[PDB]
Amino acid sequence: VPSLTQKKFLCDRTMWRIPFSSNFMSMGALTDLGQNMLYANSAHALDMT
């Protein structure tokens, strides 16, 4: 019979994570954009979706 594909994935036991560093690479406890002069003197609300 003719047929169309349908692919998903499956992940369990763990959760996604998005690191705050610039290249999204974990190079320490603090991050690159973390110890910036920005975000450590100023405040920033965020408006996720």
């Binding site: 002069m37 920005l38 003197n41 100023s42 405040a43 920033h44 609300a45």
Partner: protein, 180 residues
Amino acid sequence: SKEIPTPYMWSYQPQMGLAAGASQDYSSRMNWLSAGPHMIGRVNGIRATRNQILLEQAALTSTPRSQLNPPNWPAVQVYQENPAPTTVLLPRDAEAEVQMTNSGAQLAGGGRSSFTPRQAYLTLQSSSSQPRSGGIGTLQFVEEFVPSVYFNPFSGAPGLYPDDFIPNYDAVSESVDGYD
């Protein structure tokens, strides 16, 4: 309390570029409540350094002005962008090239050309016609608007307070332009 205050940190406005009204720093406080005398005199000895670093940073870096959070920045106190004048290489100077076609030779393709020996090229200004005013960028807000350490806080006449710490306050109207 009044003597070693947790400093008012500002907030950045991405649209207008002004200061979005400051707020008390409420996301770096130590939880010194579970500590006896040999550390609560040490924790207060830490905040008394970041209230002195932020005063020896506010003199080295910020522009000395009267109205902190001004609504309209002047032209000279805002970082401009003056790149090099764009050197444009003109390919074929047509002062002797239109004579070549009128002799009868149609051209195609494209020194630089063999029929004419000269090749002039001009330069022109690459900056704007007027410098920019009204709103500072992100890196200017990195530079200026260090967290204002406000000693003996809210201790005076009305109008003598910093009224721009309210994150709703028009700087040239003495009023919140509210729902109207």
